[PDB]
From a paper:
To gain structural insights into the recognition of the ACE2 receptor and evasion from neutralizing antibodies by the XBB.1.5 S protein, we performed cryo-electron microscopy (cryo-EM) analysis of both the XBB.1.5 S ectodomain alone and the XBB.1.5 S–ACE2 complex. We determine the structural basis for the interaction between human ACE2 and the S protein of XBB.1.5, showing similar overall structures between the S proteins of XBB.1 and XBB.1.5. Our recent report showed that the S486P mutation in S is a determinant of enhanced affinity to human ACE26.
B Cryo-EM maps of the XBB.1.5 S protein (same colors as A) bound to human ACE2 (gray) in the one-up state (left), two-up state (middle), or RBD–ACE2 interface (right). A common feature shared by ACE2 receptors bound to the XBB.1 or XBB.1.5 S protein is that the N103-linked glycan of ACE2 is positioned towards the active site inside the ACE2 structure.
Numbering used by the authors:
A (entry chain B): 953 to 1051
B (entry chain A): 753 to 828, 854 to 1051
C (entry chain C): 953 to 1001
D (entry chain A): 25 to 66, 84 to 143, 154 to 177, 187 to 244, 259 to 304
E (entry chain B): 305 to 469, 490 to 620, 639 to 675, 690 to 703
Write the structure that this text describes.
Amino acid sequence: NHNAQALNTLVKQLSSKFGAISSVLNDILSRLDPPEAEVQIDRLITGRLQSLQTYVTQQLIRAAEIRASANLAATKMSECVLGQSKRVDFCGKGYHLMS
Amino acid sequence: LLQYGSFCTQLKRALTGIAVEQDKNTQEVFAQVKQIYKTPPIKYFGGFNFSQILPDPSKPSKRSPIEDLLFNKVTLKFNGLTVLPPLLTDEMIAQYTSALLAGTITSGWTFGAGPALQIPFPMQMAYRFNGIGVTQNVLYENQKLIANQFNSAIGKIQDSLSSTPSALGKLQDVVNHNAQALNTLVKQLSSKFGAISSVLNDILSRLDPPEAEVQIDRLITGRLQSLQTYVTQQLIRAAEIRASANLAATKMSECVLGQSKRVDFCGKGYHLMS
Amino acid sequence: NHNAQALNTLVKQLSSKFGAISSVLNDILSRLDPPEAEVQIDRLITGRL
Amino acid sequence: TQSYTNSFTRGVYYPDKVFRSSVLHSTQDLFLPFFSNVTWFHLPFNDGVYFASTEKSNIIRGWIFGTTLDSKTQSLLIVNNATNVVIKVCEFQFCNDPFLDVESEFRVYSSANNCTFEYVSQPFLMKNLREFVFKNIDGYFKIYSKHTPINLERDLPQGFSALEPLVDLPIGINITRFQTLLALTAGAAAYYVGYLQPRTFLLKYNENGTITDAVDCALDPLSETKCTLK
Amino acid sequence: SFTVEKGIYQTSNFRVQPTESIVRFPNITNLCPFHEVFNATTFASVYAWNRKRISNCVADYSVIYNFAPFFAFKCYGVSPTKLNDLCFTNVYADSFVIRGNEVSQIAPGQTGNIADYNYKLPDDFTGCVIAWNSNKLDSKPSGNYNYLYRLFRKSKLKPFERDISSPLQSYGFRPTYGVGHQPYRVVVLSFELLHAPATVCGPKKSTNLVKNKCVNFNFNGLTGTGVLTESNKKFLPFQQFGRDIADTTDAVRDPQTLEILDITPCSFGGVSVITPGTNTSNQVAVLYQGVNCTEVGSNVFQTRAGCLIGAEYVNNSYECDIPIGAGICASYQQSIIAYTMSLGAEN
Ligand SMILES: *[C@@H]1O[C@H](CO)[C@@H](O[C@@H]2O[C@H](CO)[C@@H](O)[C@H](O)[C@H]2NC(C)=O)[C@H](O)[C@H]1NC(C)=O
Ligand SMILES: *[C@@H]1O[C@H](CO)[C@@H](O)[C@H](O)[C@H]1NC(C)=O
Ligand SMILES: *[C@@H]1O[C@H](CO)[C@@H](O)[C@H](O)[C@H]1NC(C)=O
Ligand SMILES: *[C@@H]1O[C@H](CO)[C@@H](O)[C@H](O)[C@H]1NC(C)=O
Ligand SMILES: *[C@@H]1O[C@H](CO)[C@@H](O)[C@H](O)[C@H]1NC(C)=O
Ligand SMILES: *[C@@H]1O[C@H](CO)[C@@H](O)[C@H](O)[C@H]1NC(C)=O
Ligand SMILES: *[C@@H]1O[C@H](CO)[C@@H](O)[C@H](O)[C@H]1NC(C)=O
Ligand SMILES: *[C@@H]1O[C@H](CO)[C@@H](O)[C@H](O)[C@H]1NC(C)=O
């Protein structure tokens, strides 16, 4: 769900104007002369760069937590499945037998 | 501002997730047992005080003296900034702690793996001594000396906590950091960001609508940047808080509901109880 | 390797223009007028921030 | 006759007209640096002048300001007497050694001439020590004053006090120099002179809203640390 | 979405709307010396420009339009049409005569002979530039040479600098001279903001006191809205405003009667909707976060989290279903009920 939401937001951000005459580069290119196109192009460039940076930062933050969970799962696989554990509530509720 | 997109939905989602995770942290750490146990009216356990940690019925809030000292020592409507109350009040957390203490005193480690089974306290202490490589006759022939040592050790704790002024820095850093972040966010509202003024009302009441946009957009960009920075910092801090809460939950499960053999996990020395 | 790469990139970023006449403050200040220098400086300031 | 002495922590006034309480505020303006020389007399204006006196016989009354001190340039001539105060900017002809005859003004100046400013109100004056701060900024002439009892002392008293604004004259003329004005038979007087500099301060307001303490952020590293930590 | 599952969602916010308006233009009415500024028939040279100070009067600018159809009417820091609603500290008026072609040379950040040798105009200027023709008044048939302008100077002039020290060139004005050389009368006004309480402001009229209610206020230009309440602050006899740690207005003194009036924002907060699944029912409950029940299902319950509307408070205890606040949950038992969560079974 989180991955789908992030991708949908990223692809939906492409339709914003960011204070420009239009949100389509071809429309601006075919309507305005090159000396004037840069002023409108810069705003779109800045907005899209900001969107990409936000997406990358969120992805890094999520990946850190996923890595922590994977480390915990690896420890559980090593300690509850390949042996018998005496740590309380680590391998279930009660006195551990096997997993 | 409507032209910029949907940043506000992202900010709201991030903050709501942080709040829900904050509630889940306490729920996971403290709600370990499902039954509310009680201590017997007669407080005799073979010569051991537990009064310094058991709840005090005289005071209205029903807290132990050490809990009172900790509560007193820690210490502590904007512009769109609000603070929400936690789901669990202090009395409920105190009840959880009292139930855990009563269970571990009257049952040992048996209530953490099934139905609670009664056992006299000296016999539980004999089991715990047997669990570190010392025979039972060592305990049974030195009951009074060990009881006196335990009483003195528990007595010195309040004085040690009170005398040291920086004993609770970890619990103060959280409050200080949150206050600093909120104050910086509030103070950022007085910046100009290269505009004629920092007040929208003055700009609207001094210039024509066709021209005020150039001044307004700079303020919008600056405030959006400030909000994004605040949210990112909050997420980064919340991750570390969650890691600490997970460690605390593991320690509660392993040191309190049982006897641990991991070195330097539940104190320095050979672990007995917590 | 990561620390060296990060420092090198941060130092290297100073030569960007970010959509300005030049990447040096002195040449922008001397060649242009103050009303336009105060506009050209902002792009560099924002990029470096 | 000149001399030298120590300013201590004297010469703090109210920068503006905004009420505050129980807060710490950082201000950037012209102030008298702590622990600095102030000349004792028995004079260029620079960027500011700090005047303090404790004389009782009222021989001191008013001051004279000007750049060239001539009838070709406007000049402030403050006159303080028992009932009112006279403020004039007219380009008076400056006599070499002005003094009050007591009350002919011929020795002060020879003639009056073209001008537009005039102000008459209660006089500035009223074991007693008096402080005055003069500065000419952005077309305005601002004067501060404060009165406080003092014990027998040859130097400035130890402690803290705040100066409240008195008048804000919209004159906006050229001043480079100044002299004192006396009323007289031989005699003697005693007063101190200090000079202001651009500094940054950290003012403290109490719950009642009066300044009680301040720190100069350029005296020593400890003060800089205090200012940074706020 | 068309389907909503069990939970609590924060939808929108709310705010208390203003009731009326309050204006406090103090009492005093005067007329500014604007007539003497214009139609004086005697305008000095650009190299020695007149300087007048205007204060303690009511500025009227309809006379400016009534004067003449000005060739130039430009304002830089302020919209020209809104000059009738602003209050200013003081106004500096500069009057002189310059050539018609050089009118464009009077602008901030502009280069020219008069710009750097006669009148330096700073970059942070706040005012208006007005010029109109004076050919029929200041053009002698043989040439009016009374107007002179500097041509040579070692260094460029400083902002608002006047020099009175052959560099001077006499102007020549004749009726036969065409556009671009006839004399133009130029008036430059400078404005000051954020200073001592403004006094040149009198075009509108005042109102009276209202208290303990959310009403717009305009105290001598201090716009905003809020509630005016009596204050116990010991103002010294010369302050006017008040601030706090957040650096915002919290007190003010009425110009008519010296009285300290606290200012607080009108009530606001968030709104949350508590509903079970749409498959189950369509009944909902609304929670106003951090708001007393007086300000806002015919059943009202007050909690620490705010005012709860549409739920009945029973005094039983069950396991938590929908979290609300400090130990209070909600569930769909058919109606919506609010209770106190139970920690567990006693033993
Ligand atoms: C547990 O320790 C407490 C504290 O030392 C003992 O309570 C003290 O009893 C003496 C004698 O009555 C009083 O003078 C003290 O004031 C008490 N302390 C406090 C803090 O009130 C208590 O007696 C010990 N437990 C047992 C069973 O004796
Ligand atoms: C004052 O000036 C004298 C010389 O003019 C100098 O020796 C002295 O250090 C200065 N400061 C004090 C406090 O006397
Ligand atoms: C004191 O000065 C005021 C102000 O000009 C004047 O009216 C008054 O007469 C003076 N008093 C005497 C005693 O001359
Ligand atoms: C004062 O200034 C005016 C203006 O130039 C001048 O006419 C007059 O001679 C000057 N002197 C006097 C005494 O008015
Ligand atoms: C003021 O007086 C000084 C000293 O004579 C002089 O140098 C300066 O040009 C005068 N005018 C201004 C505006 O400073
Ligand atoms: C301010 O008022 C309070 C209460 O009236 C008083 O205790 C305090 O001394 C006052 N502050 C002064 C006089 O500086
Ligand atoms: C809400 O207002 C009433 C009205 O007096 C008051 O009694 C009550 O204490 C208020 N509630 C809170 C939480 O302040
Ligand atoms: C619930 O508890 C008891 C019922 O006997 C009563 O004292 C209390 O007021 C009840 N609460 C209500 C009715 O809100």
